[model samples]
Target: HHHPEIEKAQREIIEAFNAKPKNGINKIKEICEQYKISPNEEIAEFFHQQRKNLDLEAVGDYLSSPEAENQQVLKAFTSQMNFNGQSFVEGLRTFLKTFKLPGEAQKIDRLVQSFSGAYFQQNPDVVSNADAAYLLAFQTIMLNTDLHNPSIPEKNKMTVYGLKRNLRGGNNGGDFDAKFLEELYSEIKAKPFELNFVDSSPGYQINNISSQNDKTFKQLNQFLEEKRNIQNIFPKLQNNNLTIEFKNPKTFLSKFTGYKGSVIIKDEKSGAAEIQVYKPSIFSRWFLGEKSKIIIQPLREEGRQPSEQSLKLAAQITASFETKVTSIKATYDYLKEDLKSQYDNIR
Candidate 1:
């Protein structure tokens, strides 16, 4: 099979930036040199316009691509709750599967999810808050490593008191004094991790909320409560800084099944591409929408300013890629049957 030039461009573009982590604009200058195009005002302008279409085009292309696990991936999370629903560990697994991440990446997830669930199962009376639960899970596991892992010296081992001293740095431990920490520490040491949490109201967030979007919010919460596990891990500026879990009230209902769109935002100073995914919803959703998006960060690669840059060059690629504009307009295509790269077609 003949590989398309755009795929080659895809690999090369990222490869150029990978050579240096944060080289930014100068890196793009090098990129255009490979293409035999001047890395000047016109080229930057051309890239600017292309980036604009990514939210609408790139997102549509990916969701509808053959790689997607299910066309109604978003609906699956929401609809699953309409029936038997999913468990915390099951929900995390679904999220990883939806994004097509490898098993190696899931190693940490398995450890944390199981441990968090066990924490709730044992402390049956504890009020299970989604955000707080994750922090404790990691904390418990990290403490376990520091204390029991034979590699560390006893002098370095942090006693329960030592940890309490640093809790909020005011000398008084913030909630660390609660029995939960000690309980969790001992529980992890003795486990076979259990998957359990007090099944409560679902979690929901809105960039900007309103009466209309509040309708989406209620259902969104319903979904989160059912799946009970959605979150991000190892957050960093170059990593997940882009709003991948974008749930703007304006956009939620537009693509309310499967994935919505990936908005490739950039750090203005560094010019590194940050792909933001505006996920869809189902009756809000049954899955932990936040954690389901934990994968997909490998899209990283390495934007712009000063108005003197030529819109003419920017306009050139924008004008040539008619299908991209079409994807933006339709918001839904029958499928990515037309998922062909038109980059080479751009003059």
Candidate 2:
């Protein structure tokens, strides 16, 4: 990860600066020598021309300037999103997968190569917005499709395979742009061939209504009511029996006792009489608490009659059930408190 040449240059610069005399005209020569670098006027002019693309300048100016809550607003906007070292590698994979397609991998590869040259030519300052510049360079690759060499007369299995391995980020000498490429890939994949977000409806301005007006906002209320109706039947079971049950039945059972009608025990195949115990409000669920319901799936003939080994296995299952039940109770209790605190904070 370390660039030895850059590190060596930096060390030399630091050494020169430390030994330079303070507050003197000769200090400029020492400063450059210490930095082990020379001033490049062409690069400076190039950077000045493309200053707007530099996000760090905006970030720094906001931090240093006296604007009311400017720093806070920046923090709020920037801090809301977090990225790390792993984001780069993961982003590369996401980029590749987004553009991953058959009969077009070669075109993507050529586009990236072309964009690389253009990006370097336009932006000479590689260190400032290196990541952002890298991202912008890949945009050209995404827009062009002919580069895929789709018209190959004698295309064989090895053509696509060769392009696949070479174009894939891992083996492509890591020349791919991590940030822009990923965003482009995502944008392309999200769209269905063509893209559209244009809206000209007057209803868009309906949300701008102020509290000063006597007008009632019934459209939102009606929308919510309709949404609730749809959500009510969203959990309809496809089969007669509910296939999706609580993961831990015994832990769900432990939330209630055999008495107090918290845990209900009843036959599913037949409406036979059974016991139901009441569950605590915090741990109430369909299996654990809802109307004190307990599904009673009786052991079948094959399960009822077991050999010594089978009996031992049944005993293990019973033990696992008890442990899982305890775990469920503990988990539900913790989650309930956490959610309550979250709601309390929100209020």
Candidate 3:
């Protein structure tokens, strides 16, 4: 008859003996004596060997013999809404069954143990939606170890490590513009030189009484004419410094209404002019169809000079224009020859 005390004694003895299994038969004998059960040689030998080989503590929650560890594993699986609990359990069991050797079992046990803690602590919603916890655990090991090779592809590297680090807010901040510029630099040998002109206009002056007085209207017309002439010549100048006067009726009504400033157009020996011109009003927007009332005067002693940066930009624009002109001439010559050939064939 198998006594309950004997069974309990046998289990404890096996656990203790395995931890220090050199005791062999003597240890099993002592356990049987303590339980007041007669020790059988075969039983003692079998139990002793079992004690010698099995390491429940080292295997920790990995052992199937211990129900507690298995319970925890199940709990981890079910805790995540994303994973099918039954499927995961069955899969894990099948995986472990393939491990014929103790070393292989231990290795996989340790791996599962690593994710088990993280899985429980993770947000259930996140876990259920994407099974992110499991993959995160896997990546955590890969990234923390020396196995993370630098030669990996960018997309893989980002997915495996960078994405995790970023999600965890572990990323170091950086300048996007500088990085973008560097990437842009690699794709193109140089930036094409080009010029961009932005113009603005002050709105039409409408006082409480619709039309302006004759004298004011005359001055306004003169101002408009002068403004057009300045716009035309300013783009053509190689280098020039000029003072601008605002003599329009609008200027007399409100000093801010018409343009009154000095402009400097510097020549860097380039066809483009480095213009330092001022508009009548800061609120001027060209889309409104309101023209800038400008007046170009002779150069004065006090005027703002063109900036170095402006000069450099102007030079680049000048170089770009030359490039376009050359391209256009070549295209025109080719078209002319093609046309002549077609006409001759027709004749």
For candidate 2, the per-residue lDDT at 266 reads: 19
lDDT of 1: 0.31
- Tens digit of per-residue lDDT, candidate 1, span 1-347: 11233224544444432332123334545555666653443222322333442332222222222222213322222222211233333333333223321111122233334334443444434525433444554344345444555666888766666655534422122354346445544554554332222121101111222224443233334444474332322122223332223332233222221233332322333232222223334321222222222112212221122121122222222232212222211112211221112212332
Query: How does residue 230 of candidate 3 score in lDDT?
Result: 34
Residues 180-273 of candidate 2 have per-residue lDDT tens digits of 3454444433332221111111000111221232112222123233543111111111122311111223331233221122111112232211
Give the Cα lDDT of each candidate. Answer: 0.31, 0.26, 0.31
TM-score of 3: 0.20
Model 3 Cα lDDT, one tens digit per residue, 1-347: 35565455566656654544334335556666877765553242343234345642222222221233334443333332233332322223332332221211122334344344434344333233223333333333223221234354545433323333444521123222333223322222122112111121111112211013333323334545467433223222224343333323323112222233323333333222222222334322211113333211111112232243333433332222211111100010122243223223322
* Candidate that beats the other on lDDT, 1 or 2, i.e. the better one: 1
Compute the lDDT for candidate 2.
Answer: 0.26
Order by lDDT, highest first: 1, 3, 2
Q: How well does each candidate superpose onto the true structure, as a TM-score?
A: 0.26, 0.15, 0.20
